[PDB]
Design a protein around this nucleic acid. Structure first.
Ligand SMILES: [Mg+2]
Ligand SMILES: [Mg+2]
Ligand SMILES: [Mg+2]
Ligand SMILES: [Mg+2]
Ligand SMILES: [Mg+2]
Ligand SMILES: [Mg+2]
Ligand SMILES: [Mg+2]
Ligand SMILES: [Mg+2]
Ligand SMILES: [Mg+2]
Ligand SMILES: [Mg+2]
Ligand SMILES: [Mg+2]
Ligand SMILES: [Mg+2]
Ligand SMILES: [Mg+2]
Ligand SMILES: [Mg+2]
Ligand SMILES: [Mg+2]
Ligand SMILES: [Mg+2]
Ligand SMILES: [Mg+2]
Ligand SMILES: [Mg+2]
Ligand SMILES: [Mg+2]
Ligand SMILES: [Mg+2]
Ligand SMILES: [Mg+2]
Ligand SMILES: [Mg+2]
Ligand SMILES: [Mg+2]
Ligand SMILES: [Mg+2]
Ligand SMILES: [Mg+2]
Ligand SMILES: [Mg+2]
Ligand SMILES: [Mg+2]
Ligand SMILES: [Mg+2]
Ligand SMILES: [Zn+2]
Lengths: 57, 24, 153, 394, 60
RNA sequence: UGGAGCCGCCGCAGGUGCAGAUCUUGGUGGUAGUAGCAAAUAUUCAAACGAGAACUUUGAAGGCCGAAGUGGAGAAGGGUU
RNA sequence: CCUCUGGCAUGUUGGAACAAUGUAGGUAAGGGAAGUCGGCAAGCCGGAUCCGUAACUUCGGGAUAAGGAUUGGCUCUAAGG
RNA sequence: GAAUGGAUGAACGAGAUUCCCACUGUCCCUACCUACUAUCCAGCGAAACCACAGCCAAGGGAACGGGCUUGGCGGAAUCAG
RNA sequence: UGUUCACCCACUAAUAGGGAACGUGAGCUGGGUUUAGACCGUCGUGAGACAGGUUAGUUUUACCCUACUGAUGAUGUGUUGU
């Protein structure tokens, strides 16, 4: 059980500071900072709750 | 080190303290 | 330098002093009054007994709150304590005085301490923080010691 | 103002120099008065407190509900070996008091008596009485000592005798014997001094001093308890829990204008190790020590005419913190002052004991010699082995 | 005589506590002259300092 | 003792005489080698260095914080610690 | 609360005895608030399972009302994919 | 004394009072044990306060004296309270 | 009852009256007087007042001199001990 730290200086649980656990070839676990989850575009009609298909979100 | 300042004024005896009161 | 009570016969008398010695003045004066008048070997044995807590030093003038012991009945007093730092420092000073007598060419085992004087030194100031945000002095009181041995046997 | 609720005083005003006792041995302050009608005898003796036990006896006073019944009694065993007389001392009555006149020691003084004259028996050279013992085998020295005896016989009014205990026959650690003056009360001064000269260099047992069912006085130093508080010392009232500076203290000493603290105000200090004399203690039995005619005679200590056992007053495992009593002893009703191994003076009574409670005879029925080192439940070794049976360690 | 530097360096190399760094008490000067790692690493490959095992915590 | 300026008389002038003012500054005593160095369980043995070891270091033993820690890293603040 | 990883030497000092009065814990035969301005402090009960739960009420509660029984270890049985 | 609101009122209150059941040193009536102090010692070590300093009875006084008067008397240096 | 007083129950030989800075807060408590917060009644236009009532309201320091309780001691007895 390795209690590990950050690798940056923002020491708060901000939306720009979301991490994920990753195992390395050095046999230790480390934080990797996740990219923020983007969303698919919405139609110009304004009447459909779903998002468009075929476009990379 | 700097010169120590004078001991503060302890608002010790007055209306608020019941530890010793005169005839009133 | 000058001393108090200069010796009558400086040929058969040696001298030794020490300035700004960070000891306690009262303990040093009491062990100096205990050591004053003895032979040099009896004096070193007495200071080793003070260090090993076998013979004590009677506190005769500065005896405020000083506990009693059984060993002070050799001196005819009630209070008694064993000043270790004082005994060691004016044991080193007797070692220096014996070396000075050896340099002058004096007989070692015939030396009697004729004069000893313990004066106060300039105090070493420090502080202590007490209640309600106040700062009071915390003053070391060191001593100047000077002594003369004389061939008296 | 005055005190609202009247209350008696905590503590006695008579017992309050409460210092530690300057003497360790219980000193007689008042010997009984002498009249030249009774024969000469000792009025005091000196024994060591051994322990405590029960006594079951028959009650024989009429009018009580406990008439012709059986009670238990708390008693003190005091081991009292026979003392050795090693000197005499004379006293003359002066308008300033009662002054000693001449002290004549004996020729052959034992080493136990010689230990008292030294504070350090090891580093000493044992030189006491060496030029005084030479004053006996010569003509001029014995003539001067006989002239001193004649001067004492002419001029002395009160004769005391110097007797010391025997520390050889005792289980105590110390060997320094206790010496004591005992005033010989009896006939005239000449017959008194002749009897003391006869009893010089001799043994004095207990039966020559005290007898059966006698009301005597106990003199001794209290068991010391140290620097105690005023609540333990004067038995004052405890302050309640809500107090700030303490609740085992004396609250008010006294008033403003002078009631500054007096001898009558209770304070904290020395409790115990006080000289005390307590009167009217009844002797139930003066015992007999271990004597040999063929083997040991252990029966004559604790076997009564109702028990007919083979027990001595020594408990199972001996007396706790004292030792084992091998000498003749006395046994007093009640509790005496002092701890174990304590020197203790037995004095004859100053008051004419003419009461029913004082002159009631005592017939023993059962002497409880069980183990005092816990909750003992057997009287003797053979009874315990006969009840328990064979153990593993057999 | 003074091995806080060598114990801290051995902890940093072994990636352990310094609770588990066992500096050799017999050969003290042969560790005290090693003022750095790659000398303390030479002491590792010589075996003069040993990683102490984990204090056991059973599960039976 | 000291090492470089000073005084008497006739007149003139003043920031001209201290025992106090809970006086201002500086220094020093009794108290007094006294009160105290008592919040959060605990240290012990052997060796190295040295003139010197209860507090430094190393080894061993016993402990504590018990993963919302007496742990590992940041922000404000400090600025070389 | 105890232990592992990690950290430390008990928090501005140690040694010898275990006096009073203290500070913080406890324990007391018999009585149970008679103490005191005042049950102040202290003390009783307390988790869970099975029963049972009054007056009143805004019909939601009161309510864990009040009041009882049980609780350990070992060896099984039956049921729960 | 009636929105300077009157009356009733479930639940709630570190709000203020009275009684009862159990309970307990609050008490009768105190006792004992433990840890840290206090005690002594090695080292370090202040502060408030201080006319001079300090044994009382009575008298008078500025009308409750450590000092004056008349008596009682007083004996070195200190330690823990 | 905060009570000083008062009255009542029971026991008892009897439950007499008082003083010591209206004894006694560096001995305790803070109960009610007598700070600052509040509620009610009366008065005042009002701020506010009320020996009117109620409620919650930090009880500081001795280590100094004396006195006392304990402990070493001290002066003379040539020194010590009994
Ligand atoms: Mg597409
Ligand atoms: Mg401080
Ligand atoms: Mg501050
Ligand atoms: Mg009265
Ligand atoms: Mg209080
Ligand atoms: Mg017993
Ligand atoms: Mg001018
Ligand atoms: Mg001036
Ligand atoms: Mg101290
Ligand atoms: Mg601290
Ligand atoms: Mg770090
Ligand atoms: Mg814990
Ligand atoms: Mg501790
Ligand atoms: Mg430490
Ligand atoms: Mg700290
Ligand atoms: Mg009880
Ligand atoms: Mg009551
Ligand atoms: Mg409560
Ligand atoms: Mg209810
Ligand atoms: Mg109206
Ligand atoms: Mg109204
Ligand atoms: Mg005055
Ligand atoms: Mg008054
Ligand atoms: Mg007062
Ligand atoms: Mg007060
Ligand atoms: Mg109040
Ligand atoms: Mg108010
Ligand atoms: Mg003290
Ligand atoms: Zn659409």
């Amino acid at each position: 059980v390795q209690r590990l730290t950050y690798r940056r200086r923002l020491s708060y649980n901000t939306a720009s500071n979301k991490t994920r656990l990753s195992r390395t070839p050095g046999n230790r676990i480390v934080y990797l900072y996740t990219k923020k989850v983007g969303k698919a575009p919405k139609s110009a009609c304004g009447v459909c709750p779903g998002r468009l298909r075929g476009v990379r979100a | 080190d700097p010169v120590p300042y004078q001991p503060p004024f302890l608002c010790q005896w007055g209306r608020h303290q019941p530890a010793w009161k005169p005839l009133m | 330098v000058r001393y108090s009570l200069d010796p009558e016969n400086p040929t058969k008398s040696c001298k030794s002093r020490g300035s700004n010695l960070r000891v306690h003045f009262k303990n040093t004066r009491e062990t100096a009054q205990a050591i004053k008048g003895m032979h040099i070997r009896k004096a070193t044995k007495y200071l080793k007994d003070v260090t090993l807590k076998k013979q004590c030093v009677p506190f005769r003038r500065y005896n405020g709150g000083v506990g009693r012991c059984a060993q002070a009945k050799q001196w005819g007093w009630t209070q008694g304590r064993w000043p270790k730092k004082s005994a060691e420092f004016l044991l080193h000073m007797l070692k220096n005085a014996e070396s000075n007598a050896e340099l002058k060419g004096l007989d070692v085992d015939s030396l009697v301490i004729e004069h000893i004087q313990v004066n106060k030194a300039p105090k070493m100031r420090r502080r202590t923080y007490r209640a309600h945000g106040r700062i009071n002095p915390y003053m070391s009181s060191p001593c100047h010691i000077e002594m003369i041995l004389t061939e008296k046997e | 103002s005055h005190r609202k609720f009247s209350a008696p005083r905590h503590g006695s005003l008579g017992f309050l120099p409460r210092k530690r006792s300057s003497r360790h041995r219980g000193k007689v302050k008042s010997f009984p008065k002498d009249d030249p009608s009774k024969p000469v005898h000792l009025t005091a003796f000196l024994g060591y407190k051994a322990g405590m036990t029960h006594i079951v006896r028959e009650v024989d006073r009429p009018g009580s509900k406990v008439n012709k019944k059986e009670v238990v009694e708390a008693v003190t065993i005091v081991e009292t070996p026979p003392m050795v007389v090693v000197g005499i001392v004379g006293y003359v009555e002066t308008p300033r008091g009662l002054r000693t006149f001449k002290t004549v020691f004996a020729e052959h003084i034992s080493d136990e008596c010689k230990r008292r004259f030294y504070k350090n028996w090891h580093k000493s050279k044992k030189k006491a009485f060496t030029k005084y013992c030479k004053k006996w085998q010569d003509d001029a020295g014995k003539r001067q000592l006989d002239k001193d005896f004649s001067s004492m016989k002419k001029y002395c009014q009160v004769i005391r005798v110097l007797a010391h205990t025997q520390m050889r026959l005792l289980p105590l650690r110390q060997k320094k014997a206790h010496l004591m003056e005992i005033q010989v009360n009896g006939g005239t001064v000449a017959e008194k001094l002749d009897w003391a000269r006869e009893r010089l260099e001799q043994q004095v047992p207990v039966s020559q001093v005290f007898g059966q069912d006698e009301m005597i006085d106990v003199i001794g130093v209290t068991k010391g308890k140290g620097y105690k508080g005023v609540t333990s010392r004067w038995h004052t009232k405890k302050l309640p829990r809500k107090t700030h500076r303490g609740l085992r203290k004396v609250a008010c000493i006294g008033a403003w204008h002078p009631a500054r603290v007096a001898f009558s105000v209770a304070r904290a200090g020395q409790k115990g190790y006080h000289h005390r004399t307590e009167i009217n203690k009844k002797i139930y039995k003066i015992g007999q020590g271990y004597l040999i005619k063929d083997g040991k005679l252990i029966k004559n200590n604790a076997s009564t005419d109702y028990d007919l056992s083979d027990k001595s007053i020594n408990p199972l495992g001996g007396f706790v913190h004292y030792g084992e009593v091998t000498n003749d002893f006395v046994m007093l009703k009640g509790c005496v002052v002092g701890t174990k191994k304590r020197v203790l003076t037995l004095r004859k009574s100053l008051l004419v004991q003419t009461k029913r409670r004082a002159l009631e005879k005592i017939d023993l029925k059962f002497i409880d010699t069980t183990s005092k080192f816990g909750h003992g439940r057997f009287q003797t070794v053979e009874e315990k082995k006969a009840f328990m049976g064979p153990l593993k360690k057999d | 005589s003074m091995l806080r530097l060598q114990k801290r360096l051995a902890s940093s190399v072994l990636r352990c506590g310094k609770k588990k760094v066992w500096l050799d008490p017999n050969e003290t000067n042969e560790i005290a002259n090693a003022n750095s790692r790659q000398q303390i690493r030479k002491l590792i490959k010589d075996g003069l300092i040993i990683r102490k095992p984990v204090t056991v915590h059973s599960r039976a």
